[PDB]
Every structure is written in structure tokens, then in C-alpha cells.
Design an enzyme around this catalytic site. Structure first.
Site, PDB file in Angstrom:
ATOM      1  N   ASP A 124     -28.134 -13.451   5.611  1.00 50.73           N
ATOM      2  CA  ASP A 124     -28.634 -13.382   6.989  1.00 50.73           C
ATOM      3  C   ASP A 124     -28.820 -14.774   7.621  1.00 50.73           C
ATOM      4  O   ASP A 124     -27.898 -15.586   7.565  1.00 50.73           O
ATOM      5  CB  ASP A 124     -29.944 -12.584   6.970  1.00 50.73           C
ATOM      6  CG  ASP A 124     -30.457 -12.189   8.344  1.00 50.73           C
ATOM      7  OD1 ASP A 124     -29.936 -11.224   8.929  1.00 50.73           O
ATOM      8  OD2 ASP A 124     -31.375 -12.853   8.860  1.00 50.73           O
ATOM      9  N   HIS A 289     -28.712  -4.257   3.901  1.00 48.81           N
ATOM     10  CA  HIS A 289     -28.756  -5.643   4.390  1.00 48.81           C
ATOM     11  C   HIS A 289     -29.450  -6.659   3.454  1.00 48.81           C
ATOM     12  O   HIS A 289     -29.016  -7.820   3.368  1.00 48.81           O
ATOM     13  CB  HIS A 289     -29.451  -5.663   5.768  1.00 48.81           C
ATOM     14  CG  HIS A 289     -29.455  -6.999   6.447  1.00 48.81           C
ATOM     15  ND1 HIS A 289     -28.342  -7.801   6.610  1.00 48.81           N
ATOM     16  CD2 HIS A 289     -30.468  -7.686   7.004  1.00 48.81           C
ATOM     17  CE1 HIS A 289     -28.646  -8.915   7.234  1.00 48.81           C
ATOM     18  NE2 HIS A 289     -29.928  -8.849   7.470  1.00 48.81           N
TER      19      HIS A 289
END
Length: 310
Positions: A124, A289
């Protein structure tokens, strides 16, 4: 100067699976009065350093399953908390948070600790920022473990890394709506939604840094910065591409959280194509994620891969 608040240590009193003793730095060039917290595990005189960079809206807690594995191989593990996050000081003003604000902090930390033979470990925003660090001093970096991340470049240079800002509705639009529009932002409840294997105790560890919304100015700004990329961010990100394609000659390991709606396969298979010598990705089918929540597998596979290569 930057006006910041500090989280009470009491909030971190009984964190599940976080036995790591705290290290701090309150004297970084460009960041006076701001105290940065980082973990420094494994042999401090190790040849290899794993620099583990977190994203949004997490902190070094996210690496708690990977840090033991890396350390047991004989390595040094550095896991810093970004200002605004974890046990680091938190600027109260969102406008004090920029791309270079976080990037220059990382450069400052790498110089202060004089970290060399770095295996960059990213995901991320740790990726968005971390992937633009090797070009600044390439001789410090020797490897890369890339998990669901990419570069914040312009939509022409790389459409893949912008197309998710458009859609799907339950993807980025949902992720951004959940973070920047609640006046009552419960990060444990958010993390239980986006990382649905988290236990109640693990999830509350993600809310620990934020007693109330006055501690979340940095958590609100990160999504906004994805949506509105400034010129410094684009130029550095687009210049980083040329480094990864042409200059990078180090060992690379990639792992995809296949259930990720935003930064999954359609972002990562472009990302692979840009990293010189990037092998076949380890596709973790059950991971969303936050791939580091399935981090024990990723860490072990990366060390096995690197060992059976050199």
C-alpha cells in the site's frame, strides 16, 4: 514548526502479539520536536536489514507475524511508524502531510541509522513511498519484497495505477468513503471489514493509536493524496519507474493478495512488468489487501526464494 499530538502509552498496554520493545528518534533533519517510533529487531550487526514499510491505515503492528521470521534468519528488522500513525507523533493538521513529508522522513531515518543491504518490504503506501527510495541512493538497497502496491504516477504513463480511483464502487470508492467521511472513525471496525480474518483483539490494536478523531489527521489525508496526486509526487513516481525497469539489478519477490479489490492482480501484474527480473508472483488466494495478515507464509516463501537464488 508542525503542531502534533502524542498518543498516551497506556493505549498500547496489552497488544496481542506485539512484544517488541520501542525505539524512538526526536531529532530528525526537517522533523524537529517530532518523535518517530520504530522497531529494531534481530541482530543489530546483521549484514541484511529488512526495512518494513506500512500503509493505510495501519502501523508496524501489521508486520508482527513477519518480523520474528525475518529475525530468526539472522537478519536485522527495522519497522518504522509513519508520523500520524502507530507510536509516532501525530501532526494535528492534514495539510502538514504530504508525499515528500513522508518520503523525506524515510530518507532521513535511513541516513540516521545508516542502513545498508536493505531488503525493502512494502505494501500500500509503504509501496507508493518506498518504491521511490532506491533511486535516491541505490547502493543501500539489495532486495525487494513487494506486496499489493504500485507507484502514484500520472494516468498516461501508467493507467493501471489510476483506473481503480474510478471503480468498482465497492472498491476504492468504498475504501475512501469509509476513511474520510465518518466523523466517528472506528479503525477497529474498519479493519474488521477490510481484513475479515482479524480477531477482536487484533482489530482493537489498529484503533489503539487513535483515542479520538484529533489523532486521525494523517489517517484522513492518505486517501485524499491517492485521489489528488501533486506534481512532486508524480515526478518522483514516474522517475522511479525508470529506476525499476532499467537500473534495478537486485533480487525481487512479489506476493499478491488475490481477494484485494483495489491493489490486486490488475495493479500487480502491471507492477511486475516494470520491475526488472521480477519472478512469478506468489498468489495468496485467501488474502485481501492486508497481505501481512497472511505474513508468515509470505516471509518464509521470500526467504526460501532468495536463498535458492542469490
Amino acid at each position: 514548526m508542525i503542531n502534533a499530538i502524542r498518543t498516551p502509552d497506556q493505549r498500547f498496554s496489552n497488544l496481542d502479539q506485539y512484544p517488541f520493545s520501542p525505539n524512538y528518534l526526536d531529532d530528525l533533519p526537517g522533523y524537529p520536536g517530532l518523535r518517530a517510533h520504530y522497531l529494531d529487531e534481530g541482530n543489530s550487526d546483521a549484514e541484511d536489514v529488512f526495512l518494513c514499510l506500512h500503509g493505510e491505515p495501519t502501523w508496524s503492528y501489521l508486520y508482527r507475524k513477519m518480523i520474528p521470521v525475518f529475525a530468526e534468519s539472522g537478519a536485522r528488522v527495522i519497522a518504522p511508524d509513519f508520523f500520524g500513525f502507530g507510536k509516532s507523533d501525530k501532526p494535528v493538521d492534514e495539510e502538514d502531510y504530504t508525499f515528500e513529508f513522508h518520503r523525506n522522513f524515510l530518507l532521513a531515518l535511513i541516513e540516521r541509522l545508516d542502513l545498508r543491504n536493505i531488503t525493502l518490504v512494502v505494501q500500500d503506501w509503504g509501496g507508493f513511498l518506498g518504491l521511490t527510495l532506491p533511486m535516491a541512493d541505490p547502493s543501500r538497497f539489495k532486495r525487494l519484497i513487494i506486496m499489493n502496491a504500485c507507484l502514484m504516477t500520472d494516468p498516461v504513463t501508467q493507467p493501471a495505477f489510476s483506473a481503480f480511483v474510478t471503480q468498482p464502487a465497492d472498491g476504492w470508492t468504498a475504501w475512501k468513503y469509509d476513511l474520510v467521511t465518518p466523523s466517528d472513525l472506528r479503525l477497529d471496525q474498519f479493519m474488521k471489514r477490510w481484513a475479515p480474518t482479524l480477531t477482536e483483539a487484533e482489530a482493537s490494536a489498529y484503533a489503539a493509536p487513535f483515542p479520538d478523531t484529533s489523532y486521525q489527521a494523517g489517517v484522513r489525508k492518505f486517501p485524499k493524496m491517492v485521489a489528488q496526486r501533486d506534481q512532486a509526487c508524480i515526478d518522483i513516481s514516474t522517475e522511479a519507474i525508470s529506476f525499476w525497469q532499467n537500473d534495478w539489478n537486485g533480487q525481487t519477490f512479489m506476493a499478491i493478495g488475490m481477494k484485494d479489490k483495489l491493489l490486486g492482480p490488475d495493479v500487480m501484474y502491471p507492477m511486475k512488468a516494470l520491475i526488472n527480473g521480477c519472478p512469478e508472483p506468489l498468489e495468496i488466494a485467501d488474502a485481501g489487501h492486508f497481505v501481512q495478515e497472511f505474513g508468515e507464509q509470505v516471509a518464509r516463501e521470500a526467504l526460501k526464494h532468495f536463498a535458492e537464488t542469490e
